[PDB]
Amino acid sequence: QPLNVAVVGATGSVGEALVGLLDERDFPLHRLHLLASAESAGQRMGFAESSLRVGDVDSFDFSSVGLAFFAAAAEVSRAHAERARAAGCSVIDLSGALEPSVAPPVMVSVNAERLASQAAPFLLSSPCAVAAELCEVLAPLLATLDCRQLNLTACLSVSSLGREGVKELARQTAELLNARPLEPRLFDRQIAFNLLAQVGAVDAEGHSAIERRIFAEVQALLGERIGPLNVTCIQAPVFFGDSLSVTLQCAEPVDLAAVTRVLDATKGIEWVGEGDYPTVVGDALGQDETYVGRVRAGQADPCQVNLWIVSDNVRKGAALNAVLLGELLIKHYL
Amino acid sequence: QPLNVAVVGATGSVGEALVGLLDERDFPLHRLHLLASAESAGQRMGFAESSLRVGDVDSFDFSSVGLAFFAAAAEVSRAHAERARAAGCSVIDLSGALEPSVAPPVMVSVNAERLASQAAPFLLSSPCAVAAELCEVLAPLLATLDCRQLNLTACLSVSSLGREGVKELARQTAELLNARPLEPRLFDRQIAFNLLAQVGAVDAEGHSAIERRIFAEVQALLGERIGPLNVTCIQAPVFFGDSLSVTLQCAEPVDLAAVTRVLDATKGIEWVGEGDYPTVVGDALGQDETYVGRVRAGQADPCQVNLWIVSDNVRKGAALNAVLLGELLIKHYL
């Protein structure tokens, strides 16, 4: 009957956005429990004008809740998500720690019908921001387009590395601007005014962890309706938001008007045309729409279509998608 | 007998780098004439420890020189490059103003054999930095790889817009960092900590001028040895250097070792492996090598290979390529 919710990792940037969204969207919960690692435990957070104590995830009784959003480090998910589900609590894990089979990635806008096959209590993953934003835009297009090759170049902001990344960028930028010795802390090289070729270390085949994750999730979410995905994630000196440059190679010449029509008609997507474009700073930050522009064909190949996508990785790609999934689970998986 | 050289646009950032390279590389000139628009005329520049007056291009007698580097605005080239050639002066135009047929793009590392068919006085284009850096890396690979599709996402620094772009970025960044009202001048939106989807306005088919240029030059330079090119140029909040993310779709599974071997063996290219990568700030700025890293196959497709390329757009992509072409014209087109 009453729905009790836990938010694990509540003090992180994604956890915090998710709690604000529960309040904003009037999520129909009875009791809300905010949890973090013993580190962050004991501090207070605002919710619905009231003030809540963050508790230690290690001490928490998950039988007390009916739904849990895991927005903490992957190690927290590994340590607790399955145990939480055994306790009767449905889990939405944003860290992807238990992908691909124990906790399959699910998105309402993409593969919601994949819920119909699990039995409650659920244990699901909500995709990383980049994969969520790519798939949200591609899903409605794939009813019309036959995509044979998909190229993604993702330019990631430093918020992808959490609040310390935001701090590192601001600090490095300042040191340089008033001519002080640059001293990197989170990195071993300059990130200010620089583009890094990769995000984090690469494996023996040259792929980074985020690239692996995006790849695994896109193939779980979209499946067979696309051909080979090629993913590059670059680190940009920007604070917030994902900026994606996508090329689709299709089977047939692309009806560009139909593409922009579909994007324009889809809820949660804002189509930008007439030679203007969205940006993370100008458009994406702090709001729910994923913005899509620069829809055009190849200069040579009418069978190619490019898209430019910008979205708030914290609020939209991660948090709102997780909450929308929770809203779906409430709605008909009562 | 004696070789007299003019540098048109000598006070611009590319013109200045080119003059320094003439001195550094001991270009065998007799007299050097520095020229600019009446704007910049009258100011002095260093060359070989001596001090030279910049003259007005409008007043200049091109019969006095045997070779001219046009590193000025495209309008200066349109107004003077052909007239200069009629006067007996061979022209290397870096602005691309007279492409593709009047002044064909030529690169020593790529299509030098295209010189063998024009008669002196020459009138040639040296490619824009991005096209030069792409082609320099692809040319030696195409002897081994059969490239069926080429995807380029180019992340351009603000120096691509000249010195005013550098100034705009520094000023906007500073305004934000000490919490002052942001006021864009060169742009109508924020560039600081932002990624712009395009560089400049787009045409009716959605392509920007730089994208058109890169496309036309790559097809003139590489020709038939590659399939369709797809180009996106993004504006990054970085001061100097081009950062390129390239995907090649090949006919056969790519021998990655052979790729890195070729790149490692090619003069002017620095191959970076072992999971490290070059950046514009860390590696490219102020030097001659074009750095290439992140050589890997697709996660799904062994027929795909990715490359990451960084180069100094001013010194290397534009200026050094132009000078190398001039050195070739001296060497056996005496």
Q: Are B234 and A149 within 8 A, CB to CB? A: no
**A&B contacts, CB < 8 Å:** 178
Which residues of chain B neighbour A196 with C-beta distances below 8 Å? 277, 279
Element (H, E) at A151: strand A147-156
B202 with B245: CB under 8 angstroms? no
Q: Are residues A302 and A207 in the same domain?
A: yes
Tokens 């009446």 correspond to B38
Q: Are residues B106 and B182 in the same domain?
A: no
Please report, as a single letter, which amino acid is at residue B246.
V
Q: Are residues B254 and B149 in the same domain?
A: yes
Residue A306, beta-bridge partner list: A247, A296
Which residues of chain B neighbour A209 with C-beta distances below 8 Å? none
Query: Chain A: residue nearest B170 by CA?
Result: A177
Neighbouring CB atoms inside 10 A of B24's CB total 13
State how far the Cα of A324 lies from the Cα of A310, in Å rounded to an integer.
19
Neighbouring CB atoms inside 10 A of A11's CB total 21
Q: Is A306 on the interface with B (CB under 8 A)?
A: yes
Sheet holding A32-36, edge to edge: A55-56, A32-36, A5-8, A67-70, A90-93, A123-125
Q: Are residues A283 and A142 in the same domain?
A: yes
- CA–CA distances in Å: residue B266 to residues A8, B137, B284, B291: 53, 9, 17, 11
Q: Find all residues with CB under 8 Å of B207, minimum gap 6, and list them.
A: A296, A299, B215
Q: Are A306 and B230 within 8 A, CB to CB? A: yes
Q: Are A232 and B198 within 8 A, CB to CB? A: no
Which residues of chain A neighbour B194 with C-beta distances below 8 Å? 238, 279-282
- CA–CA distances in Å: residue A280 to residues A277, A288, A290, B221: 10, 12, 10, 36
Q: Are B301 and A228 within 8 A, CB to CB? A: yes
State how far the Cα of B330 lies from the Cα of B334, in Å rounded to an integer.
5
Interface of A with B in 127-156 (CB under 8 A): 149, 151, 153, 155
Q: Are residues A63 and A158 in the same domain?
A: no
Q: What is the DSSP letter of A24?
A: H
A321 with A127: CB under 8 angstroms? yes
Q: What is the DSSP letter of B54?
A: P
State how far the Cα of B206 lies from the Cα of B229, in Å rounded to an integer.
15
Q: Are residues A105 and A197 in the same domain?
A: no
Q: Are residues B171 and B106 in the same domain?
A: no
Q: Which DSSP string corresponds to B95-120? A: S-TTTTTTS-B--HHHHGGGGGGSPS
State how far the Cα of B30 lies from the Cα of B4, in Å rounded to an integer.
5
B126 with B325: CB under 8 angstroms? yes
A55 with A35: CB under 8 angstroms? yes
Q: Are A194 and B281 within 8 A, CB to CB? A: yes
Q: Find all residues with CB under 8 Å of A184, minimum gap 6, and list them.
A: A168, A172, A190, A191
- CA–CA distances in Å: residue A306 to residues A13, A47, A270, B210: 31, 41, 16, 16
Q: Find all residues with CB under 8 Å of A226, minimum gap 6, and list them.
A: A138, A142, A147, A150, A218
Q: What is the DSSP letter of A71?
A: -
Core vs surface per residue A109-143: b (16+ CB within 10 A) or e: bbbeebbeeeeebbbbbbbbbbbbbbbbbbbbbbe
Q: Are B301 and A230 within 8 A, CB to CB? A: yes
Q: Find all residues with CB under 8 Å of A316, minimum gap 6, and list them.
A: A129, A132, A133, A284, A287, A288, A289, A290
Tokens 């522009």 correspond to A293
Element (H, E) at B140: helix B129-141
Q: Which of B79, B81, B54 is nearest to B68 (CA)?
A: B81
Tokens at A136, concatenated:
């949200």
A179, burial (CB in 10 Å: exposed 0-12, middle 13-18, buried 19+) = exposed
Tokens at B20, concatenated:
């320094």
Tokens at A159, concatenated:
């918020």
Q: Are A300 and B193 within 8 A, CB to CB? A: no
Helices B129-141 and B256-265 pack at an angle, to 10 degrees, of 120
Domain tally, chain B: 2
Optimal mutation site among A245, A254, A296, interface B, most CBs of chain B within 10 A: A245
Q: Are residues A152 and A120 in the same domain?
A: no
A66 with A4: CB under 8 angstroms? yes
Q: Are residues B196 and B92 in the same domain?
A: no
Tokens at A292, concatenated:
């899509």
Q: Are A195 and B236 within 8 A, CB to CB? A: yes
Q: Is A182 on the interface with B (CB under 8 A)?
A: no
B28 with B90: CB under 8 angstroms? no
Q: Are residues B32 and B158 in the same domain?
A: no
Q: Find all residues with CB under 8 Å of A77, minimum gap 6, and list them.
A: A8, A70, A93, A95, A97, A98
A11 phi, psi to nearest 5 deg: -90, -5
C-alpha angle with apex A129: A123 to A132, nearest 5 degrees?
70
- With H, G, I as helix, E, B as strand and everything else as coil, classify residue B326: helix
Q: Which domain holds residue A274?
A: 129-312
State how far the Cα of A24 lies from the Cα of A21, in Å rounded to an integer.
5
CATH number of the domain bearing residue B308: 3.30.360.10
Q: Are A151 and B155 within 8 A, CB to CB? A: no
Q: Are A275 and B239 within 8 A, CB to CB? A: no
Nearest by CB to residue A280, choosing from B195, B212, B294, is: B195
Sheet holding B5-8, edge to edge: B55-56, B32-36, B5-8, B67-70, B90-93, B123-125
State how far the Cα of A16 lies from the Cα of B169, in Å rounded to an integer.
32
Tokens 């849990």 correspond to A68
Residue A310, beta-bridge partner list: A243, A291
CATH number of the domain bearing residue B62: 3.40.50.720
| A34 Rama sector, left if φ>0, alpha if ψ -120 to 50, beta otherwise | beta
Q: Are residues A277 and A139 in the same domain?
A: yes
Q: How far is residue A132 CA from its own chain's centroid?
A: 5
B247, burial (CB in 10 Å: exposed 0-12, middle 13-18, buried 19+) = buried
- With H, G, I as helix, E, B as strand and everything else as coil, classify residue B314: helix
- With H, G, I as helix, E, B as strand and everything else as coil, classify residue B324: helix
Which residues of chain B neighbour A238 with C-beta distances below 8 Å? 193-195, 237
| B274 Rama sector, left if φ>0, alpha if ψ -120 to 50, beta otherwise | left
Number of alpha carbons in the 13 Å side-chain half-sphere of residue A108: 18
Nearest by CB to residue A236, choosing from B205, B212, B236, is: B236
Tokens at B33, concatenated:
């004439």
Q: Are residues A164 and A300 in the same domain?
A: yes
Q: Which of B32, B30, B31, B33 is nearest to B41 (CA)?
A: B33
Tokens at B299, concatenated:
């996660």
